[PDB]
Amino acid sequence: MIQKTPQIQVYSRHPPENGKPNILNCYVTQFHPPHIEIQMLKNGKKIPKVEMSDMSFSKDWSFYILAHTEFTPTETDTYACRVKHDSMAEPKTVYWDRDM
Amino acid sequence: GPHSLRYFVTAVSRPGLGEPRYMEVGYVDDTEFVRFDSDAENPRYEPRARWMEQEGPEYWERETQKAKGNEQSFRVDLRTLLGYYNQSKGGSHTIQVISGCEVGSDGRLLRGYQQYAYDGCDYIALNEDLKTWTAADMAALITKHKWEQAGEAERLRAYLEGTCVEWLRRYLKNGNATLLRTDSPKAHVTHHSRPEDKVTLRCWALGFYPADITLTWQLNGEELIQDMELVETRPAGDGTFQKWASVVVPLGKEQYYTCHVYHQGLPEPLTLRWE
Amino acid sequence: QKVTQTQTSISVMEKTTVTMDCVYETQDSSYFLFWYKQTASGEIVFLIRQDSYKKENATVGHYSLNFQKPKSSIGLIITATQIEDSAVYFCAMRGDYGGSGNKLIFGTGTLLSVKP
Amino acid sequence: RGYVYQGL
Amino acid sequence: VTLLEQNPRWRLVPRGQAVNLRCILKNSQYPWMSWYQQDLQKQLQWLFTLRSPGDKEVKSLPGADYLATRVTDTELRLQVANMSQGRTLYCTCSADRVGNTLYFGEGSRLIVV
Ligand SMILES: *[C@@H]1O[C@H](CO)[C@@H](O[C@H]2O[C@H](CO)[C@@H](O)[C@H](O)[C@H]2NC(C)=O)[C@H](O)[C@H]1NC(C)=O
Numbered sequence: 001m002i003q004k005t006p007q008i009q010v011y012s013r014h015p016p017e018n019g020k021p022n023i024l025n026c027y028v029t030q031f032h033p034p035h036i037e038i039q040m041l042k043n044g045k046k047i048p049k050v051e052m053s054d055m056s057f058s059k060d061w062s063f064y065i066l067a068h069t070e071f072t073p074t075e076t077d078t079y080a081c082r083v084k085h086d087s088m089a090e091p092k093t094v095y096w097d098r099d100m
Numbered sequence: 101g102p103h104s105l106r107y108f109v110t111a112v113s114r115p116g117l118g119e120p121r122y123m124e125v126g127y128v129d130d131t132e133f134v135r136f137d138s139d140a141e142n143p144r145y146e147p148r149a150r151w152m153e154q155e156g157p158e159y160w161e162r163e164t165q166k167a168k169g170n171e172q173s174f175r176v177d178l179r180t181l182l183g184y185y186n187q188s189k190g191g192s193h194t195i196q197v198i199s200g201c202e203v204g205s206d207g208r209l210l211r212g213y214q215q216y217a218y219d220g221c222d223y224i225a226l227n228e229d230l231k232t233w234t235a236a237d238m239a240a241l242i243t244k245h246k247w248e249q250a251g252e253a254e255r256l257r258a259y260l261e262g263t264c265v266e267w268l269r270r271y272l273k274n275g276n277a278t279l280l281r282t283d284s285p286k287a288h289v290t291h292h293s294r295p296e297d298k299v300t301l302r303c304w305a306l307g308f309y310p311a312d313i314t315l316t317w318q319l320n321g322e323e324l325i326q327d328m329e330l331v332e333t334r335p336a337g338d339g340t341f342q343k344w345a346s347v348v349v350p351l352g353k354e355q356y357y358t359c360h361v362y363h364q365g366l367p368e369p370l371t372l373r374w375e
Numbered sequence: 376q377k378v379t380q381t382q383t384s385i386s387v388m389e390k391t392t393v394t395m396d397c398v399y400e401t402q403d404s405s406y407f408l409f410w411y412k413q414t415a416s417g418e419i420v421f422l423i424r425q426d427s428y429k430k431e432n433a434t435v436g437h438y439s440l441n442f443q444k445p446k447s448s449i450g451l452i453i454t455a456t457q458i459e460d461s462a463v464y465f466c467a468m469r470g471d472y473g474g475s476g477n478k479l480i481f482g483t484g485t486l487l488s489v490k491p
Numbered sequence: 492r493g494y495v496y497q498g499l
Numbered sequence: 500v501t502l503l504e505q506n507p508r509w510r511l512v513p514r515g516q517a518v519n520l521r522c523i524l525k526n527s528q529y530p531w532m533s534w535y536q537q538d539l540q541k542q543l544q545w546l547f548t549l550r551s552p553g554d555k556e557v558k559s560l561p562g563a564d565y566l567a568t569r570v571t572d573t574e575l576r577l578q579v580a581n582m583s584q585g586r587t588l589y590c591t592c593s594a595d596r597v598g599n600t601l602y603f604g605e606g607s608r609l610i611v612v
Binding site for chain 1 (some may be wrong): 105214218220331337342344
C-alpha cells in the first residue's frame with residue numbers, strides 16, 4: 001500500500017522541423033496504481049487517436065506507459081502531456097519541445 | 101548469454117466501473133513477445149513479435165484459455181484480500197505477479213522464481229530453494245500456510261524446472277534473429293544558451309537499441325562527471341531509444357569539451373564536440 | 376475419450392486382490408487423477424489421488440495406485456478385498472484449465488462385486 | 492507458456 | 500462431520516415441473532462449490548463452479564435446463580427446469596480451483612413420475 005508519483009518525459013521523436021507526418025511520443029514511468037489520466041493535447045485541447053501504448057510494470061512493481069499517436073510537426077503553437085494520477089493532490093503537465 | 105522467460109501479471113479492481121482488468125505480458129530475454137488484455141476488442145493471447153506468428157493456433161488456444169482461467173482466479177483473489185486486510189468493498193486495488201526461469205548459456209537452470217505484490221508492496225515470494233515461501237506480512241502468512249498444506253510449491257517447481265525451461269529454449273530458436281540483434285546510435289552536441297554569458301553543452305544520442313548506452317563528458321583526460329546533467333533513457337517508437345547528457349562550461353571554452361558515446365552496436369566509442 | 380474405464384464389472388472372492396483399469400488423455404503439463412467410489416445409497420466417497428509430477432505410486436489403507444505415465448494409465452489396486460468393498464468405482468481427472476472452474480472428468484465407472 | 496496460478 | 504449439506508434429498512415430480520435445490524457449506528475452508536449431475540446410467544458430468552456470492556449462471560444439458568446461484572459464502576442454489584428424465588444432482592466443495600480434491604455432498608435425487 002504505497003503511491004509512487006509519475007515521472008513524465010515530454011519529448012519529440014525526431015529533431016525540430018515542421019512538415020513531416022509521423023508519430024509523436026510521451027513517456028510516463030514510476031507510478032502506482034496503474035490508473036492514470038493521460039491523453040494527447042494540441043495547443044491546449046484534444047486529439048482523436050491518443051494511441052497511449054499498452055501498459056507495463058517493472059521488477060519493482062511500478063507501472064510505465066508510452067503516450068503516442070500520429071502528428072505533423074509544428075512551430076510556436078507548442079504541445080504537452082495531459083497527466084493526472086491519484087498520487088498527487090493536484091494534476092500536472094510539462095510542455096513539448098522541438099529540441100528535446 | 102543467459103536467457104530468461106518471464107511472465108508479468110496484473111489484476112486491478114475498479115469497483116462500480118466494471119470488472120477487474122486483467123493482463124498477462126510475457127518477455128523473453130526481456131522483450132515483449134506475448135500479451136493478453138482482458139480489455140481488448142476480443143480478448144486473446146496475441147503474439148507481440150513477428151517470430152511468434154510461426155506458432156500454430158493450437159498454441160494460441162491453450163494460452164488463451166489459461167488466461168481466462170487465471171483471469172477468473174484473480175477476480176476471486178482480489179476479493180480474498182479484502183477480507184484478509186479487512187479493507188472496504190468499494191476501493192481500488194492491484195495484484196501483480198512476476199514468474200519465470202533464468203537459464204544459462206549452457207542451458208542449465210540458474211534461477212526459478214515467482215513473486216507476488218498487493219497494491220505495490222511485496223506480498224509473498226518463492227525462495228531460491230524452490231521448496232518454501234517467504235511471506236511479507238500477516239495476510240501473506242495465511243496464503244503461505246494454505247500453500248504449504250496444498251503442496252503448491254511442488255507444482256510450481258515442476259512448472260519452473262520443466263515447462264518453463266523447455267519452452268524457453270524454443271521461443272529462443274524461433275526468436276533469435278530478431279532478438280539478439282542490435283542498432284548503433286548517432287550523436288550531436290547542441291548549444292542552447294538563452295541569450296546569456298554561460299554556455300551549457302548538450303549531447304544527443306538516438307536511433308539505438310538496446311537501451312544500454314552510456315554518455316559522458318571529460319575535460320580532456322579527467323572526468324567532468326560531477327555537475328553533468330542527463331535524463332533517463334526514453335523509447336522513440338520504432339523499437340529504438342534516445343538519450344542526452346549535458347553540463348555547464350565557461351563561455352569561450354567550448355572545444356575543450358568532449359562527449360563520449362558507448363554502445364555495443366559500435367565498433368568504437370563515439371567522440372564529438374560542437375558542430 | 377478423456378477418462379476411460381474399459382471394464383463394466385468385476386466379480387471376485389473375499390480376500391482376493393482386484394485391479395481396476397483406467398486410461399486417460401490430457402494435454403496439460405500438470406494433472407491430477409482420482410478414484411472415488413459410489414455406494415448403494417448413492418453417496419460418492421473419495422478414495423485416493425495421484426499427482427502427475429509426483430514420482431511415486433500413491434497409497435492409503437488397502438487402496439493403492441499403479442501409476443504409469445507413459446501408458447497414460449492409472450489402475451486402482453485393492454488388496455485383501457472385503458465384502459463392504461462392493462460398489463461402483465469411479466476414475467476421474469482434473470479437466471484442463473480454462474474458465475470452467477472446478478472440472479472433474481469422470482469415466483463410466485466399474486461395478487465391483489465381492490462374494491462371501 | 493504461462494502458468495496456472497493458485498488462489499491466494 | 501461432513502463438509503456439505505444438500506436438500507432436498509429426493510423429489511418425485513412429473514415431467515417438466517421445476518425444482519429448486521440448495522446446498523449449504525459447513526466448512527468454509529472449501530469455498531469452491533460445484534454442481535455435478537449423474538444421469539440414469541451413472542455418468543457423472545460437471546455443470547457449474549461458483550465461487551463468489553452473486554455468481555449466477557445458466558447451462559442447458561440434454562434432458563434439463565439449469566440455473567445456478569452462489570447466494571452467500573455458504574449457500575449454493577440450483578434451479579432445474581424442463582426436466583424430462585430423472586438424474587441426481589451432487590453438490591461438491593474443494594479448497595481451490597487447481598488440483599485440490601473435490602468432496603461430494605449426498606446428492607438430491609430427482610425422479611420423473
Ligand atoms: C508403481 O509401481 C508399479 C509396479 O507395481 C510401476 O510399474 C512399472 O513402471 C514402469 C513404467 O511403465 C515399468 O517399466 C515397470 O515395469 C514397472 N515398475 C515396477 C516397479 O514394477 C509404476 O511405475 C510405479 N509408479 C510410479 C511411476 O511411481
